[PDB]
Design a protein around this ligand. Sequence first.
Ligand SMILES: *[C@@H]1O[C@H](CO[C@@H]2O[C@@H](C)[C@@H](O)[C@@H](O)[C@@H]2O)[C@@H](O)[C@H](O)[C@H]1NC(C)=O
Ligand SMILES: *[C@@H]1O[C@H](CO[C@@H]2O[C@@H](C)[C@@H](O)[C@@H](O)[C@@H]2O)[C@@H](O)[C@H](O)[C@H]1NC(C)=O
Ligand SMILES: *[C@@H]1O[C@H](CO[C@@H]2O[C@@H](C)[C@@H](O)[C@@H](O)[C@@H]2O)[C@@H](O)[C@H](O)[C@H]1NC(C)=O
Ligand SMILES: *[C@@H]1O[C@H](CO[C@@H]2O[C@@H](C)[C@@H](O)[C@@H](O)[C@@H]2O)[C@@H](O)[C@H](O)[C@H]1NC(C)=O
Ligand SMILES: *[C@@H]1O[C@H](CO[C@@H]2O[C@@H](C)[C@@H](O)[C@@H](O)[C@@H]2O)[C@@H](O)[C@H](O)[C@H]1NC(C)=O
Ligand SMILES: *[C@@H]1O[C@H](CO[C@@H]2O[C@@H](C)[C@@H](O)[C@@H](O)[C@@H]2O)[C@@H](O)[C@H](O)[C@H]1NC(C)=O
Ligand SMILES: *[C@@H]1O[C@H](CO[C@@H]2O[C@@H](C)[C@@H](O)[C@@H](O)[C@@H]2O)[C@@H](O)[C@H](O)[C@H]1NC(C)=O
Ligand SMILES: *[C@@H]1O[C@H](CO[C@@H]2O[C@@H](C)[C@@H](O)[C@@H](O)[C@@H]2O)[C@@H](O)[C@H](O)[C@H]1NC(C)=O
Ligand SMILES: *[C@@H]1O[C@H](CO[C@@H]2O[C@@H](C)[C@@H](O)[C@@H](O)[C@@H]2O)[C@@H](O)[C@H](O)[C@H]1NC(C)=O
Ligand SMILES: *[C@@H]1O[C@H](CO[C@@H]2O[C@@H](C)[C@@H](O)[C@@H](O)[C@@H]2O)[C@@H](O)[C@H](O)[C@H]1NC(C)=O
Ligand SMILES: *[C@@H]1O[C@H](CO[C@@H]2O[C@@H](C)[C@@H](O)[C@@H](O)[C@@H]2O)[C@@H](O)[C@H](O)[C@H]1NC(C)=O
Ligand SMILES: *[C@@H]1O[C@H](CO[C@@H]2O[C@@H](C)[C@@H](O)[C@@H](O)[C@@H]2O)[C@@H](O)[C@H](O)[C@H]1NC(C)=O
Ligand SMILES: *[C@@H]1O[C@H](CO[C@@H]2O[C@@H](C)[C@@H](O)[C@@H](O)[C@@H]2O)[C@@H](O)[C@H](O)[C@H]1NC(C)=O
Ligand SMILES: *[C@@H]1O[C@H](CO[C@@H]2O[C@@H](C)[C@@H](O)[C@@H](O)[C@@H]2O)[C@@H](O)[C@H](O)[C@H]1NC(C)=O
Lengths: 797, 632
Amino acid sequence: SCSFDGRIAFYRFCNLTQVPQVLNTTERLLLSFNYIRTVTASSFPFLEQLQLLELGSQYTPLTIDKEAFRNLPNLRILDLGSSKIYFLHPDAFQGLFHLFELRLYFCGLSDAVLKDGYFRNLKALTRLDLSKNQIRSLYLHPSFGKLNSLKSIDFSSNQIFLVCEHELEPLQGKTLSFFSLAANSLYSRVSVDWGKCMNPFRNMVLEILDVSGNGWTVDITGNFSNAISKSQAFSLILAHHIMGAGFGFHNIKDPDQNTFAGLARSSVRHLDLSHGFVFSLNSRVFETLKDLKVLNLAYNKINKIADEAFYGLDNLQVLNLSYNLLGELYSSNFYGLPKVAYIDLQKNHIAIIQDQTFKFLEKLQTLDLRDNALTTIHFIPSIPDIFLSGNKLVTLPKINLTANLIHLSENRLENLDILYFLLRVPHLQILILNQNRFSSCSGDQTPSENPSLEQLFLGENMLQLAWETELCWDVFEGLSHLQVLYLNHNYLNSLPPGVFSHLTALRGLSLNSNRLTVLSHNDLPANLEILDISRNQLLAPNPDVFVSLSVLDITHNKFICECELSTFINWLNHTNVTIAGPPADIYCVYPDSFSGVSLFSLSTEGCFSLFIVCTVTLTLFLMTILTVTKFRDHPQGTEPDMYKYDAYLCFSSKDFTWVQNALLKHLDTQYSDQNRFNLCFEERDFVPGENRIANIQDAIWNSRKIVCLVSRHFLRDGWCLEAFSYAQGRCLSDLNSALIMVVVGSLSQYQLMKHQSIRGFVQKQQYLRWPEDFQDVGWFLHKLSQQILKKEKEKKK
Amino acid sequence: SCSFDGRIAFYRFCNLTQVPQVLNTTERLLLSFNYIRTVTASSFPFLEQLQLLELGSQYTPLTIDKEAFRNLPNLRILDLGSSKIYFLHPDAFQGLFHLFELRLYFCGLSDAVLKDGYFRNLKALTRLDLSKNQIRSLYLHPSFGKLNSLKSIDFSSNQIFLVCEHELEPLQGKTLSFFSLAANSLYSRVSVDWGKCMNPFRNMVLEILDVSGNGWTVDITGNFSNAISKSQAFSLILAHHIMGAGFGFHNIKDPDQNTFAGLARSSVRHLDLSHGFVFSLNSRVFETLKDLKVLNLAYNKINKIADEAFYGLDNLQVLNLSYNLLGELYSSNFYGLPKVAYIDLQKNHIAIIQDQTFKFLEKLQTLDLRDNALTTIHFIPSIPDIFLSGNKLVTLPKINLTANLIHLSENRLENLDILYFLLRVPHLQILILNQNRFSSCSGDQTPSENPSLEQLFLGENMLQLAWETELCWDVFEGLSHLQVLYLNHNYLNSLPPGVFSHLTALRGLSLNSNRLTVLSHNDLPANLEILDISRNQLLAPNPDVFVSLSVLDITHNKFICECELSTFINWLNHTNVTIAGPPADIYCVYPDSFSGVSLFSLSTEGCFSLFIVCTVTLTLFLMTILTVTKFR
Ligand SMILES: *[C@@H]1O[C@H](CO[C@@H]2O[C@@H](C)[C@@H](O)[C@@H](O)[C@@H]2O)[C@@H](O)[C@H](O)[C@H]1NC(C)=O
Ligand SMILES: *[C@@H]1O[C@H](CO[C@@H]2O[C@@H](C)[C@@H](O)[C@@H](O)[C@@H]2O)[C@@H](O)[C@H](O)[C@H]1NC(C)=O
Ligand SMILES: *[C@@H]1O[C@H](CO[C@@H]2O[C@@H](C)[C@@H](O)[C@@H](O)[C@@H]2O)[C@@H](O)[C@H](O)[C@H]1NC(C)=O
Ligand SMILES: *[C@@H]1O[C@H](CO[C@@H]2O[C@@H](C)[C@@H](O)[C@@H](O)[C@@H]2O)[C@@H](O)[C@H](O)[C@H]1NC(C)=O
Ligand SMILES: *[C@@H]1O[C@H](CO[C@@H]2O[C@@H](C)[C@@H](O)[C@@H](O)[C@@H]2O)[C@@H](O)[C@H](O)[C@H]1NC(C)=O
Ligand SMILES: *[C@@H]1O[C@H](CO[C@@H]2O[C@@H](C)[C@@H](O)[C@@H](O)[C@@H]2O)[C@@H](O)[C@H](O)[C@H]1NC(C)=O
Ligand SMILES: *[C@@H]1O[C@H](CO[C@@H]2O[C@@H](C)[C@@H](O)[C@@H](O)[C@@H]2O)[C@@H](O)[C@H](O)[C@H]1NC(C)=O
Ligand SMILES: *[C@@H]1O[C@H](CO[C@@H]2O[C@@H](C)[C@@H](O)[C@@H](O)[C@@H]2O)[C@@H](O)[C@H](O)[C@H]1NC(C)=O
Ligand SMILES: *[C@@H]1O[C@H](CO[C@@H]2O[C@@H](C)[C@@H](O)[C@@H](O)[C@@H]2O)[C@@H](O)[C@H](O)[C@H]1NC(C)=O
Ligand SMILES: *[C@@H]1O[C@H](CO[C@@H]2O[C@@H](C)[C@@H](O)[C@@H](O)[C@@H]2O)[C@@H](O)[C@H](O)[C@H]1NC(C)=O
Ligand SMILES: *[C@@H]1O[C@H](CO[C@@H]2O[C@@H](C)[C@@H](O)[C@@H](O)[C@@H]2O)[C@@H](O)[C@H](O)[C@H]1NC(C)=O
Ligand SMILES: *[C@@H]1O[C@H](CO[C@@H]2O[C@@H](C)[C@@H](O)[C@@H](O)[C@@H]2O)[C@@H](O)[C@H](O)[C@H]1NC(C)=O
Ligand SMILES: *[C@@H]1O[C@H](CO[C@@H]2O[C@@H](C)[C@@H](O)[C@@H](O)[C@@H]2O)[C@@H](O)[C@H](O)[C@H]1NC(C)=O
Ligand SMILES: *[C@@H]1O[C@H](CO[C@@H]2O[C@@H](C)[C@@H](O)[C@@H](O)[C@@H]2O)[C@@H](O)[C@H](O)[C@H]1NC(C)=O
């Protein structure tokens, strides 16, 4: 099983009938590599909370009866992969109301025609997949008309030879409906129809159109381009064929001219050539298609790049050149792409990038160069974010203010390319430097000019000898990451106190996997929440302790447990458990006799054992069964009746910003995993079956208390339903702890209409107003967590 | 210190001068993560029986003087790793007579040229290593001529651009000397010399030749393959480059035909492609090389294999295909490998193996398939030994007499695959079955026909309900291993006496971690030396005792130290100390007052150290209910 109570998997166990042992709350069920064959009615009346029900995977089903999936309303998707169904029953998929996708990969369609298909009662049917089938006719059945949510379909590996006009009637029937027609993928078609009254693709807007391998020869694939004329399609991928680019080159230099002749009239926006194995890319390829807003080239082997190659693209935006470089490069790649913005040159084998490379550009706002090249920045436009990982030594950078994001992982940098790069990016926020193997660290000429520096990781790297200078002297909110910096403790003994002096808004410093001997403590910062210290050789105490410190990781370190240092072992004990890390991962090293004991067990004695270990286990057994009772909200299971909630939160819709961020989060954070402090709502947990006013009525009985949030808006339409209820039937008295008033905002007097119950709970004056200052934020949470846990007043007098 | 008197290790202690506290008999000294810098004469006149003296590891040695290692004749190896020496003194390594290997990993050679090197007085110098250096010239100094014991050297991460003929003169001087030239590994070379009177590798037999990453482009690397022509090399690894196989494919389809052109003349015997990241394996790769006596493909990612893929290999023997499977498989992989014998398909991800897989084979004598596939034996030739572990349910086996060794660990077997597989292996000797989780145990249809059965371990498994039948009725010298078999004590009561009946030449039976209630004793075997009995719930004595029993393990068991069973507690005593196990690990369980006391301390009476703790625990359990309800 993957997850307890929810996710259960059964990967090949050879069962005959379904598994009943599973619970009814199982949301993700997986039955594959098994056999059931005959699927009779009432198959799964057990589970009713399913979503991911991957049934069909080589389950070799022979037939399918009706009422198979009747008790599966919340059924999201169903994957009938590699199945062999012969008989298809009309009312088999009945009851599936929330069915979106449906994978019918190799369902064994011996009954090719889709007319007999039964996907009419599937309105939420979005992505209906049909691959590895034997469909002969592309003729869309009238049932597609009802399919409004139908967004994508993948017709691949079927058959379909001719594509008449009459086979596209339901298409023109819908005025607004996206359609990712992924047909003609790995087929054996021959010809199609053209002309007629209206072209088969005339007055028809499609989302996506794939033609991954259509014909056998270039001569028969030209007629098809004459039928796709006058068609408004977003994308159009011509993959698995084009081995070379050019004026209009595909295979043979003679019939390759009639191809672009039909796509010239149509205004193509997106053109992709993935897995096309384009060796050479001749001069001027996309010239007829200037309306190409976005292009795509994934997994290729480009080598011929002319200065007139990308010409024609007057308005390009996106362009992913993923794995298609290597084999030298020239100067000025994109000379005709001023409006370019996003480019993805991930995973390549470029040697050395020249100076003038990213010439004639301006609107470039995102440069992703993962494992691209040796990187040489000189004429790189205003790009806010850039990714440069998996590289080597980098040369002088050249960027501007616009750069607010930048990444550098798994590299080999120096103290030059980092200084100048930061000199003009005060808008920088996130920055990463993991496993860069820093060579030399300057005194203060590397991380200069960067006030808004938020994230800054310096893990796995080396410095000039050891840390002995302050680099972060201008970084206020600098969250550093010092993981194994190979720092020699000899120079760390006289560590400059002016390093952790400027840092005032530090969230947490992580000094782990390091190699120090004396753990200095400069508690100048006051916003430090954590300090990870593990895999070290520390053994030195310090009276100076931070104020906001809470979680101090100090596990697995060379601790000397003898009579020499008794002041250090004394500090860690005085710091209570509230200020310490897992005691379980702390053992003494130096001691040969005693090895594997936590510091919170060693005896502080100055330099009969069976009695010692027998008395201490008794003293342990004297307190551990005396403090768990005392130490360990109001238990719902001990309540007289059966209440489901602790407090019903009554509020307004305009004041959701507070009830959703502060109130709920501060009352749910405690005993969250224990699910003890539950809150009743009116929109999160309701009954459609029920009435508005009464929805609150039931919430009163179920909840232990009622904590409303009176406001200048809560009176406008939140009290209009409450006051009316108090008139007829009474429930909440005056001086009872059952009701708790909370004033989030001062409410005037003119707002109060003729309601007599609103001014009744204000007369008693027992509300909990929201403090204005931030220092008072806590005294409110105290009482807000008290009055509710308070025992309700009894009925007797 | 690792071992008393001999092995002492000082891992990061920060000490200027060497540790004088060590003894003279210290054979293994480890001084790393420290600092000494100036190494003056008479460094270690204390220790004189050293062998493993790893000195240099980031010890940042600035300079080195003479007479440093004078008092270290028995000094075997020295590893100066990650060091930074500037000045090299000629007579620095004097006195080393038994110095074999020498690791100079990143010694910081600011004085690149090796002419200034001083390794003449080192005759025992076998494996001289020089990695991560800055050597520019491959020119071998005349000093190599004296190095007769010089077997291997690793020239990696240096510089070396051109490899002339004149840089390979000391080689031709020696008529008999193995040399594992591991040069050109991660360099930045460009070209070499060709033609001339004689080729640079003409009339020169080498043991090993590594070229892990040489050029930058396929074009410049083709010149190198034309200079290595006519060379008698035992091995030749082309690693970290070939991302695809084929008729002679490497990178670009045009300049990859001139590669095999030069290696065609030279008769290659060993060809390895480790860490090559070979994805696709086209048809017919090694065709020009038919003299390849042995092959090797370690750490690769082979998706699919063609039928004519392994074509060309006429006389193959060894073939370690370690971690390079997954991605479906076809029928008849090695159709052209009759003479193949040893193959290593360790660590792979194969779903199911077809019927006809090991077709056209015969001289296969050792099949190692550690964590290979679901294993489906059908057309397997005469293979004496085979290793099948880290697998799942195994189907009907098909082997012959030739199989004398077989292993099965960490699996899920039944009573079918073990029966038939044993029906034709009377020559079997060793057999392991640790953690196989046996499903159903047959009465006598599983361990049949196997007289020469020597080792037979049945640790961690299950049987039909419990042990209640004699399986080893034909196994004479069968050394069983019964560790935790989940045997229910209810059926163990009527344990068939005919189980330990046939077993006469038994060395020792291990009945540990089990869960029996009564310990029976059928002393029929007269050769049983030992009988491990621990982690059980036994409490039954028996007059029948073996004769050759010496060590009887009987610790950590549910023993009832009361007045009920007095005959059992009286037996373990008469059996003397010579026939017993560690009394220290024997404590009473059932009792609550008398707890934690060895059977050889209990008194036999009819119905004082561990007594005071039983009284102080009561007094503190009485004085507590008193002062708790009062305090807080
Ligand atoms: C999973 O299925 C196992 C196999 O069930 C059947 O076993 C015999 C009787 C044959 O008829 C075979 O075709 C069947 O597959 C069960 O033993 C097992 O109990 C099942 N798991 C559950 C739900 O307990
Ligand atoms: C699993 O769920 C089964 C069906 O539960 C309910 O049955 C009736 C009472 C209706 O209220 C219906 O809406 C529900 O589906 C139970 O019969 C069964 O006891 C459950 N399994 C467990 C946990 O016992
Ligand atoms: C492309 O279409 C061309 C014209 O097809 C038909 O030719 C005659 C039979 C007319 O009467 C009418 O049916 C059409 O105009 C073909 O000559 C050519 O072969 C086609 N290309 C292919 C698919 O091979
Ligand atoms: C850039 O292109 C990326 C890859 O696109 C495709 O992803 C799948 C469907 C493959 O099977 C293959 O055909 C392509 O590689 C996208 O993930 C990314 O969204 C694209 N950039 C944009 C516009 O966001
Ligand atoms: C980076 O910015 C340089 C300076 O641009 C501006 O100069 C004057 C006009 C002021 O308005 C000032 O605030 C600006 O900083 C440009 O000269 C330079 O071309 C830019 N770098 C690039 C992308 O070439
Ligand atoms: C150790 O902890 C002592 C108690 O701290 C807290 O005291 C009140 C406010 C309670 O809410 C309680 O639960 C807490 O444990 C401190 O008085 C003492 O200063 C601490 N030791 C140190 C590090 O000085
Ligand atoms: C745990 O620490 C105990 C108390 O620590 C401190 O002792 C003195 C020096 C006081 O002035 C005050 O700071 C604290 O109360 C020790 O009594 C005890 O032995 C320690 N436990 C262990 C691990 O032995
Ligand atoms: C190990 O070395 C310890 C100290 O050695 C050095 O002492 C001075 C000269 C400083 O430069 C210091 O940084 C060095 O670490 C000794 O105290 C110790 O006794 C030595 N270990 C032994 C052999 O007992
Ligand atoms: C270690 O050995 C030192 C030298 O002892 C001997 O000196 C002359 C006589 C030679 O025969 C030489 O081979 C011998 O090693 C001693 O000074 C020293 O005490 C010894 N260390 C110990 C074990 O105390
Ligand atoms: C490989 O060698 C090519 C030409 O080989 C010879 O070069 C000199 C010695 C001439 O005088 C003549 O003997 C030959 O033509 C170069 O064209 C080629 O660039 C070299 N490979 C590299 C490093 O690119
Ligand atoms: C079979 O191959 C085994 C391991 O292969 C590799 O050995 C060396 C070169 C290392 O690079 C290692 O990482 C590899 O796994 C050998 O142990 C074995 O000797 C080879 N078979 C032979 C011929 O004996
Ligand atoms: C296993 O052995 C079978 C029998 O081989 C022999 O048959 C006659 C000729 C006698 O000489 C007898 O002693 C031998 O046992 C073969 O038929 C069979 O092919 C072998 N199994 C394999 C590897 O296919
Ligand atoms: C150890 O055992 C000694 C011998 O016990 C029995 O002596 C007679 C009565 C025979 O019947 C024979 O079966 C046994 O050997 C005791 O005398 C001695 O008390 C024992 N030691 C202890 C634990 O007290
Ligand atoms: C117990 O051992 C008795 C004699 O003890 C042995 O005495 C001498 C001769 C040495 O061999 C010494 O090692 C022995 O401990 C036997 O008389 C007696 O039969 C043994 N008890 C049993 C198990 O029957």
